[PDB]
Every structure is written in C-alpha cells, then in structure tokens.
Amino acid sequence: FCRFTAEGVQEIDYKDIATLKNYITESGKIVPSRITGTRAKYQRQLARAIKRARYLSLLPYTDRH
Amino acid sequence: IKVRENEPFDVALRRFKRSCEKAGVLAEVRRREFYEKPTTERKRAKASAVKRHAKKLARENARRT
Amino acid sequence: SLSTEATAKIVSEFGRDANDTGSTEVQVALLTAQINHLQGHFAEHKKDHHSRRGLLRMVSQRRKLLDYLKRKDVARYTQLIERLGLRR
Amino acid sequence: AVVKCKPTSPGRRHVVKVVNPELHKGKPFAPLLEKNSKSGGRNNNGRITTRHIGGGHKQAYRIVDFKRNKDGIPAVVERLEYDPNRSANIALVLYKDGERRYILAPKGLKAGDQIQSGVDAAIKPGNTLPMRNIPVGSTVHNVEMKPGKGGQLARSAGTYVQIVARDGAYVTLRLRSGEMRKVEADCRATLGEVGNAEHMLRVLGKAGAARWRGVRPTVRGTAMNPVDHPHGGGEGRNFGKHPVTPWGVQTKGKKTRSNKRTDKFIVRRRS
Amino acid sequence: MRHYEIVFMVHPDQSEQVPGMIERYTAAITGAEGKIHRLEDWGRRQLAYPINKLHKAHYVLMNVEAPQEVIDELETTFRFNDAVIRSMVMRTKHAVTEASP
Amino acid sequence: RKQVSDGVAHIHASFNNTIVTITDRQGNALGWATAGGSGFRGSRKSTPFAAQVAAERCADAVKEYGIKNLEVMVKGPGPGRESTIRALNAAGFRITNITDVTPIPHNGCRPPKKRR
RNA sequence: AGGAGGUAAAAAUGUGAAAA
RNA sequence: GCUUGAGUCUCGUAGAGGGGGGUAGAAUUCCAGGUGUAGCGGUGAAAUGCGUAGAGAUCUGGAGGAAUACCGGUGGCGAAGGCGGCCCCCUGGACGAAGACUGACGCUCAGGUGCGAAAGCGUGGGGAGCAAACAGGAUUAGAUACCCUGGUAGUCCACGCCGUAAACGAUGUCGACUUGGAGGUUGUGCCCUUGAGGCGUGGCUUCCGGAGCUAACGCGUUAAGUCGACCGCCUGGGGAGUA
C-alpha cells in the first residue's frame, strides 16, 4: 500500500506503461483490487487504459504469441 | 508460460505456474458452468469467509494460555 | 437531452426571467421541448424502453401540471394551451 | 412494401402485393424501349422445348445497359421504374453529357442520386469499377466474367456477391449459391446489393396471377399415362418407381455438372 | 467541435510515406476549425503482437477537437486504406496539450 | 533424416492419455509415441508414470535424426504434465527452454453439461 | 497467520396389532 | 397567504442503465497442404465411435458462428425482469452543494395502460460449440435414467406474439419518530495536506446486536419496533388454483 491520486490529483492515461506494468502481470492479466489496494474508480480508469494498450499492440492479450 | 531458468532448476521450479492459473482458466471452464450457480456458490463461499473472519475477532482472548 | 442554452432563454421567454424558473408555465414548456425532442429518439430505435419510461415520466407529471394550472387560473391555463398546442 | 389485401373474395384472400410508391408512374422512356415478342417456349423447329410457358400480359423490352462502359461521367438518377421483365427494378439514370440510360437499381439508391462507373469512382453503391480497384471484403452485384461481356452474376432482386480474396489477376467470389468461384480481377462490378429484396415476400394468391405472368399449368407426372411419362399408369396411384424426368433421367440427386472448361474456376461446390 | 483523440497505426510501407496523410488529415480539420492539440508521432515503434502479419507499425496521435460529423468522416476514411490500421477515438474530458511519450 | 541437433517435443497431456511427439523447429513431425503404445490401458494409460514411459519411448528412434537439443511444447493438463519432461531429461538431452501453451478461451465456446 | 491442484461403479422393499 | 411537502432551473459525480453501428484477440469446429506413423478419444471399468484411403498428434495458411478470460469487488445502475472486452453516436433516470423561484401542483389507487427470465409459437436468415426428443453402446435384475459417443428443435440476429416463474430482501407503497458498533462505496464541509491524515456531512449498501416485537426463529434506525394514509389479499387440509 502506498499513495494514490486520492489527494494527489492526476488524470490517468494508458501511455505511462511503467504505471501500467505495476498492475499487470507478465502473462498480461489485470491485477485485482486486493493486491493494488486502489479505489475501483481509478482501477476502472486503469481498466480502460489496459484495453487501449491491448488493442493497439502496446500490450498483449496473451503473452505467448 | 515462458520459462527458461536456464541452468539451475533441473525440473521446473515454476512457482509462477502455480501463480498464473494452475487450474484457473482451465479446470473451471472444463464443463459444468451453470451460468447462475457461480453467483450463488461464491456468495456462499464468501459467507464462509465471514465465518473465517468471525473466528478471528473472538480469538486471542483466553484459549487456556 | 434538452441542452442548457435552449433551457436558458425559454424560461425567460415564458416567465419573468431565468430566475423565476419554478413556475408552472416555464415547467410546461421545458417538458414539452424535451418531449418533442425525444420523439426522434423514439422515431428510431423502437425498443429503448428504459429511456421511453423516462419519456412517459414527464407527461404524467405534465398531466398534473395542466390540471393544476386549470385549477389556478382558468384563462391563463387556456392562454398557455393556445400558445403551446395540445390537449386535443 | 409488403401489404396483405383484404379477404373480401376467395382468390383475394392469400394475396400479398408488394407495392413501391417510388416507382415512377407513367409511360417509360421511348428510345430505350424495344419490343420483345413472346415465344411460347417454342424454337425454330416449332416444337415446344421448354414446357409450361405461354400466355400472359404483353411486355415491352426495356433496353438496359449493364455493360457500364461510360467512365468518369457522373450519372444523375432520374427516377425509379418498374420492369415487367426483371425481378429487380430498373432506374432511369442520366449521365453528365446528357444521355439517358437504364441500369439496375442497387439497394441504396434514391431519386436524384449521383453515381459514376469507371476506375476513378467512389465506393458508393451504383458505381462500377474493376475488381482490382475494389477493396476486398466488399459486397457487389452486376458482375462480369469476361472483361467486356457486360455482367452475368448477381442481378436478381435483392442479391449480392461477397468478394473473398484477391490473388494476383484473380478474385475469389462467394456466389449466392454458396459456390466459391475465381474470376478475372479485371472484370467490373456494381457496388452494393440489388434493390427490391422484398420481392421474395410476394405471394400470388390465385392461379390467374400465375397465368397473366405467362406460366401455364404443370401436370403431375404421376397423373400421366405410361406412354407419356415414365411414372403414371397404376390404379391406386401406386408409384413403385424412382423419381425421373419425363425423358428418363434420374432426378433427386443427379449432379449433372459436366462442363470441364470452366471447371478450373470452381473453388468449392454449393452445399 | 469536441475534443477527440485519433490514435492509429500505419503499415510499414506507407509508414515511409506517412506525413502526407498526416498533412491531409490535418487539412480536413483546418477547414472545420479543428483546434489541434498534440501531434505525437512516436515513429515506427514495435508492436506487442503480430497483427495478422509482421509487426512494427508507425504510430500517429491526433488529440483533435472536431465536431461529431467531422470526426465521422475522418474515422470512416481510415477504414478504406490498408495503410492505416486500427484507428480509434476518445471523449473530451478537457484533454490537455501535454504527455507526448 | 536431415541429422540436425534441434528438436521440438510436443507434449499432449490429457486426462485419459499422454501422447508425446518430437517434431522439429518448423513443426515437421519426426516420430511419436504414446502412453498407450507402452502397453498401458484405460486407467493405467492416464498415470504420471506411464507418461514417463512415453518420453522414454519417444527418446527411441530420434537419435537417427541426430537430435541433441529439444524444447518442450506442453499442451493440456493431465496425470504427468511435468513428470514426462523429466523422462526427456532422464533419457538425457539439452533442454534449452520450455513453453507451456495453455488454451485461453474468452468464453467463445460452450463447455458440456455431463458428469453428474 | 493466508490460499488452493487431488480423494463415493453398483445396492430395492418391509405395505397388516395393540403402549397408564 | 407563506413555506420546511413536492417540483423547475444552476454547477458537478457515478455507473454491465437502454438502443443502434463498427471492431479486436484467444479458444472452438471445418477445409486445403507438409509431415508422421499405429493407435486415438472415452470410463468407475469399458464399449459405441474414428483410423492403414491413412485418423489422432503436430506446424502453415484460409474460413466462419458464438461468448467476452484476467479485470470482477455482501462493487454499481435499473421499477422489476435484468444488464458486463473495446470504441463512437443517440439517449433515460438517480445522487451531492448551496443559491433563485414556484407556492400543496401532495401520497396512493378499483378499472385501465405499459414493461416483463426462460421456454414455446409465427416469418425470414444463421448455425461453431452446446444440446430436449431421439439413436447406439454400457450400468443394471430391467435403465425407457444417472454414465459416454454422436445428434435435430432450440440456444444466436431482425421484426412480432406470448405475459407466466422460489418474477423471492418469500417481507406492498409513502411520510415521521426511536441506543450503537463494524466495514465497503460515491459527492462534499472544514482544519495544520504541514504523512496512505484529523474531526463532520449527506445518498446507497453489508454484517453483529439494545430496548421493543414475535409462537419461536430471528428483524432489529434499509425493523417483522412505535404510529398515520390508501391499496391488494386470507378464512381448516384436500377437491383446486381444477370445472
């Protein structure tokens, strides 16, 4: 558990993949709230971010091609 | 999924295999999905976790120590 | 979805100004515009019942409104229905 | 559109007429109207080759131009018109130079519309351009087989053809029958689906509706005599034999596709 | 005139002639008052997975402000070229003129 | 026989059988052997040990092809699933890496309703 | 403490009687 | 007449809410081909079935229908039914803040009207997987069932009917009053944000329980508590929700 955008306001996007990799595993599965410790509001804001990298070939759906 | 562990493993040494699915997507969608029992059984399974949490707050009290 | 600027001038057009926005007459107008604008939303799609429940929500409230306006001022109620066009 | 008529009289009961008010009501265009004499299903020898044909209302041959040789010239849709000959609908169009010409009606076509044939056209339905200039995955009609014949495929009411692939000088088409057929990529095709897909819903209601279309009654083969059909004869309508044509050819499962010349173009058979 | 974000991918061959399309697509918006915000061309970067064939497509961002019809003509035009693959858009949310890489 | 060092041992494990095939890097098959080919039947076909007998049998007749190193494509669950890979190492080889391919359906299919 | 891979082929009926 | 009831407007929040149009990946089935041989799939144990034409297995490419892995959470929205990959268009309703104004226009309701899982039915398409009826082989005393191999309707899309469910928090709708603790979720007041905080404030939602209540179980400030309003309904079990 650490700090989030609850006080430090930030508009979330999908480009900062380093921020995305903290919440996705190597197989490319979205990490649930019980491990992120995040509010689901920002997680759903990040869930749409995951599909953008998934669809635009920045991230894979299945890690084995 | 994609393991090397090059030289020193000799068998598998895949704790990640048992941390990605292990039976997850596999053993669950083999057969018998029911479309509605998962909604009810998991709420019942989570209710058993309320009983697992009910143990904790009445614990560490006397217990003949 | 009855945008603000449309609602902005009509209350002043039907009532005293934009600040006298709680009166019956200004309420009759905003419902009618929202009702009429949503006709195209129901001229198409033909199954959008959840939104259609929203459409039917307004006219029921408007039914009490014209009935209340009749009860308050006979001439003014007829002044509005000849100005808007309804009741059949 | 689809309209069922009233049951006021037996013979008016099951009739469903498919009206179209967009069809221009009036006399058709004169110079593009030729006379088509009927034949009654008879040939130069005078015998009847194709049966059950003869009679019906008199029809005038609409001179259509499915060839679509005028390229680059934007054509203006004059009006939609009914055609007695075709299951689909014709559309009088007018090219920019000032020539009137009938073409088929694509599904998405309106009055006063604009289309143009040729290699530099859009992907708007009604345009006609070579298949190598067409994006794969499209939906076309009025397709040729010879580059310059004029167009033989997918010209019925409410039809189309899916373009499957493009391999070099060839284009594989998934035809309406369920057959995949390679054709020359240099051939032309009219974009979209053919207008009047509602023709299928039309039911005739009575026998007179069939006669004034020009189709005579069909006699059941089991009702004939042994000298006239391989079926027939018998007392209690006892069939006993296998289904055949009147000239002794097994029907009900006889693949008589014997061409061998165009056989190299069929990819898959119809199912 | 609402903020959109057209991010698409260009096929390797036409990736060598990509800016003229960018010159053309931005030509569409100046006529309809497109207040462009970013022009983040990453360059022909790597794809995570092969899109039906070989990877490494060219990345172009728009972050455009256009009307609903103008954003429609742009999006539909991308569908008919095999160069531009997988175009998308986004809602406004007052998209800031920052964050390029 | 091409006599190349490379090999790809596709491992198909199932709940009733364990079939292993040693293909090449392209996927061209060279030789295969199964849990059933070693004599095991029914219940005995699906055991972790019988999967090991299969890999001992696939190790036969691949040495004619000069196969030195191999990489495992294991596909599907079952009794062996990891044990038969040790039999590929008990026979002795140069195991470079292992890729475990899993069927990942996103619900596009419908599983059966049997097994009361 | 915290989470899970694995562990039941077959086998019916008793019908009619009384509890200070 | 006035205004706390109710309602309109003002700036924000949230969301699988609804309809239409596109679109992606994996898996699955089919097809062509390379390869490669005697088994393969299945079970409690098998057998049917499939295969020496050459299956299964495996790699290459193409083709379709269907549903959206992880995310996903006693999480949320909706009157309920019910609704979830992604993007766009159209669009309903709810909640929070404090202002301006309307001035009881309120609550509910026989009849009426609309919505309404699945299955089923009508017209026209689709049809991978799955799968009533059904077919075969088994289990068995017998199996018409449970078991396995296949397999049609149907399941899927469009337009329509149908109007019934354990359609169930089994608990009607609306408003007021009446100890708390413990959590999740979404706006927001305010202070030192001087640290994932501190003391409040409303809406929604979860669990344990106080008085009271009840036949008991248990509900227990979203009460089955203390009251008022209107509506619907029950009169022993069947017979029967049938004639």
GROMACS .gro file of C-alpha atoms in nm, chain C:
model
   88
  131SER     CA    1  -3.117   1.583  -2.400
  132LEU     CA    2  -3.254   1.940  -2.367
  133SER     CA    3  -2.926   2.137  -2.365
  134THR     CA    4  -2.877   2.432  -2.130
  135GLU     CA    5  -2.883   2.719  -2.380
  136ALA     CA    6  -3.222   2.602  -2.505
  137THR     CA    7  -3.344   2.598  -2.143
  138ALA     CA    8  -3.172   2.930  -2.086
  139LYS     CA    9  -3.385   3.153  -2.293
  140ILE     CA   10  -3.714   2.971  -2.276
  141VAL     CA   11  -3.771   3.025  -1.908
  142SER     CA   12  -3.713   3.399  -1.961
  143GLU     CA   13  -3.933   3.379  -2.271
  144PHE     CA   14  -4.223   3.215  -2.088
  145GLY     CA   15  -4.184   3.350  -1.736
  146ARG     CA   16  -4.049   3.672  -1.587
  147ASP     CA   17  -3.683   3.585  -1.640
  148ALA     CA   18  -3.446   3.293  -1.591
  149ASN     CA   19  -3.470   3.339  -1.213
  150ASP     CA   20  -3.847   3.278  -1.198
  151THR     CA   21  -3.785   2.920  -1.306
  152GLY     CA   22  -4.012   2.736  -1.067
  153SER     CA   23  -4.347   2.848  -1.210
  154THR     CA   24  -4.593   2.617  -1.380
  155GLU     CA   25  -4.574   2.779  -1.723
  156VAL     CA   26  -4.199   2.753  -1.753
  157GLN     CA   27  -4.222   2.393  -1.639
  158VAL     CA   28  -4.483   2.313  -1.904
  159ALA     CA   29  -4.252   2.445  -2.170
  160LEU     CA   30  -3.938   2.258  -2.072
  161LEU     CA   31  -4.124   1.933  -2.059
  162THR     CA   32  -4.282   1.988  -2.400
  163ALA     CA   33  -3.948   2.064  -2.561
  164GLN     CA   34  -3.785   1.761  -2.402
  165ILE     CA   35  -4.086   1.554  -2.505
  166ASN     CA   36  -4.075   1.674  -2.864
  167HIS     CA   37  -3.701   1.648  -2.898
  168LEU     CA   38  -3.709   1.290  -2.778
  169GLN     CA   39  -3.969   1.195  -3.040
  170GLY     CA   40  -3.683   1.141  -3.288
  171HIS     CA   41  -3.506   0.925  -3.028
  172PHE     CA   42  -3.823   0.710  -3.035
  173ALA     CA   43  -3.891   0.764  -3.406
  174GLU     CA   44  -3.577   0.548  -3.427
  175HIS     CA   45  -3.452   0.254  -3.216
  176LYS     CA   46  -3.808   0.131  -3.138
  177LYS     CA   47  -3.708  -0.070  -2.829
  178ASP     CA   48  -3.546   0.185  -2.594
  179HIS     CA   49  -3.800   0.132  -2.319
  180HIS     CA   50  -3.579   0.239  -2.027
  181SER     CA   51  -3.542   0.578  -2.191
  182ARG     CA   52  -3.907   0.555  -2.305
  183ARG     CA   53  -4.002   0.510  -1.939
  184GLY     CA   54  -3.826   0.842  -1.888
  185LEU     CA   55  -4.037   0.998  -2.166
  186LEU     CA   56  -4.361   0.873  -2.012
  187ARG     CA   57  -4.245   1.001  -1.676
  188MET     CA   58  -4.268   1.357  -1.795
  189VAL     CA   59  -4.614   1.360  -1.944
  190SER     CA   60  -4.765   1.213  -1.631
  191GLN     CA   61  -4.614   1.499  -1.432
  192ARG     CA   62  -4.729   1.739  -1.705
  193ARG     CA   63  -5.083   1.600  -1.674
  194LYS     CA   64  -5.094   1.717  -1.314
  195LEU     CA   65  -4.938   2.047  -1.423
  196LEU     CA   66  -5.202   2.146  -1.674
  197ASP     CA   67  -5.469   2.025  -1.435
  198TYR     CA   68  -5.318   2.237  -1.160
  199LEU     CA   69  -5.299   2.534  -1.396
  200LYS     CA   70  -5.665   2.491  -1.484
  201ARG     CA   71  -5.742   2.487  -1.114
  202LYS     CA   72  -5.541   2.802  -1.052
  203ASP     CA   73  -5.631   3.034  -1.336
  204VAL     CA   74  -5.891   2.930  -1.591
  205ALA     CA   75  -5.797   3.192  -1.853
  206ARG     CA   76  -5.420   3.159  -1.810
  207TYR     CA   77  -5.436   2.781  -1.849
  208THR     CA   78  -5.621   2.828  -2.175
  209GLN     CA   79  -5.373   3.105  -2.260
  210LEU     CA   80  -5.091   2.852  -2.240
  211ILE     CA   81  -5.257   2.571  -2.435
  212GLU     CA   82  -5.336   2.810  -2.718
  213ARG     CA   83  -4.972   2.922  -2.705
  214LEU     CA   84  -4.822   2.569  -2.699
  215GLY     CA   85  -5.080   2.349  -2.874
  216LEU     CA   86  -5.200   2.031  -2.702
  217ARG     CA   87  -5.485   1.864  -2.503
  218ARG     CA   88  -5.655   1.759  -2.831
   0.00000   0.00000   0.00000
